[PDB]
A paper describes a structure:
[name], a hyperthermophilic carboxydotrophic archaeon, produces H2 through CO oxidation catalyzed by proteins encoded in a carbon monoxide dehydrogenase (CODH) gene cluster. [name] with a DNA-binding helix-turn-helix (HTH) motif is a putative repressor regulating the transcriptional expression of the codh gene cluster. Monomeric [name] adopts a novel ‘eighth note’ symbol-like fold (referred to as ‘eighth note’ fold regulator, [name]), and the dimerization mode of [name] is unique in that it has no resemblance to structures in the Protein Data Bank. According to footprinting and gel shift assays, dimeric [name] binds to a 36-bp pseudo-palindromic inverted repeat in the promoter region of the codh gene cluster, which is supported by an in silico [name]/DNA complex model and mutational studies revealing the implication of N-terminal loops as well as HTH motifs in DNA recognition.
The T55I mutation in [name] led to enhanced H2 production accompanied by the increased expression of genes in the codh cluster. The KD values of the wild-type and the T55I mutant were calculated to be 61.8 ± 20.5 and 948.0 ± 130.0 nM, respectively, clearly indicating that the DNA-binding affinity of the mutant is much lower (over fifteen-fold) than that of the wild-type. To get structural insights into the reduced DNA-binding activity of the T55I mutant, we determined its 3.4 Å resolution crystal structure. The overall structures of the monomeric and dimeric T55I mutant are virtually identical to those of the wide-type. The r.m.s. deviations of monomers and dimers between the mutant and the wild-type are 0.827 and 0.941 Å, respectively, for all Cα atoms. Despite this structural resemblance, however, the T55I mutant has a remarkable structural difference in the orientation and conformation of the N-6 region that is engaged in DNA recognition. In contrast, in the case of the T55I mutant, the N-6 region runs in a different direction due to the loss of the hydrogen bond, which is the consequence of the isoleucine replacement at position 55. In this conformation of the two N-6 regions, the two phenylalanine residues cannot form π–π stacking interactions. In the resulting complex model, it was obvious that the N-6 region of the mutant clashes with DNA. Consequently, it can be concluded that the altered conformation of the N-6 region induced by the T55I mutation disturbs the DNA-binding activity of the mutant, and the conformation of T55I mutant is not adequate in DNA-binding.
Author numbering:
A (entry chain B): 2 to 139
B (entry chain A): 4 to 144
Write the structure that this text describes.
């Protein structure tokens, strides 16, 4: 509905949506059609979603170590690839081979044990595993 | 400009490695004034994106308490615990753990808050502060 920030109406829609209200119920409270509210909520979620990728890029460039995984690679061969670079660059990965498997199973573009598309697994500055769907430069 | 361009990303990448603005200007083939405009503009996008995620996490908060300018910081814990037990009160912080939080990350001058803010517990059970006050919308219907 706008750019660079969330307007009052976008704040009011998502707050009523989080409380469990249906678009048709919100349409009566604001006095508008539910079709426009469906478009407004779509723009609000699209704006937050685009802002989330900005924080991911900011945390990815400030990462201690990053590992790329191509489409089709096994999910179980990621730990050995990550810990391999953890020796050349003398840093500490505070997770085990099974600690990061449970991480990739939850929030990583994977179909069963096979990766769907390309993604990047990196460890940020706060020692927290995070996922990024952006292959980048040197 | 709804995202970070490849040139803004390349600037922040070279800057994260420890390069100075004068050194970055030569690699990209542009003036140091352009690097100053882009890097300042790039950090402004990251700052604006944080407020979007912060408000998004405030809307998805389990419990939220508003604090107005002039109110005491010490009456906030009793106010939070009072309203937290309406639902399943799961604030795993003590009366002193959230006071030490407000002293660290809250707009307060000595014992009095400077401007209005909201103390809420997000989805990860961690205290957060937002200068928004959206509880007026929780009183419709």
């Amino acid at each position: 509905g706008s750019k660079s920030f969330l307007t009052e109406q976008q704040i009011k829609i998502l707050r009523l949506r989080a409380r469990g209200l249906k678009q048709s119920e919100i349409a009566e409270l604001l006095g508008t059609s539910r079709a426009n509210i469906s478009i407004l909520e779509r723009r609000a979620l699209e704006k937050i979603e685009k802002a989330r990728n900005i924080i991911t890029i900011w945390e990815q460039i400030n990462s201690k170590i990053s590992v790329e995984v191509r489409k089709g690679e096994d999910i179980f061969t990621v730990p050995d690839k990550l810990f391999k670079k953890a020796d050349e660059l003398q840093i500490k990965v505070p997770y085990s081979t099974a600690e990061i498997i449970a991480f990739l199973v939850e929030h990583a573009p994977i179909s069963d044990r096979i990766a769907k598309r390309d993604f990047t697994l990196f460890l940020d500055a706060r020692d927290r595993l995070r996922i990024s769907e952006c292959l980048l430069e040197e």
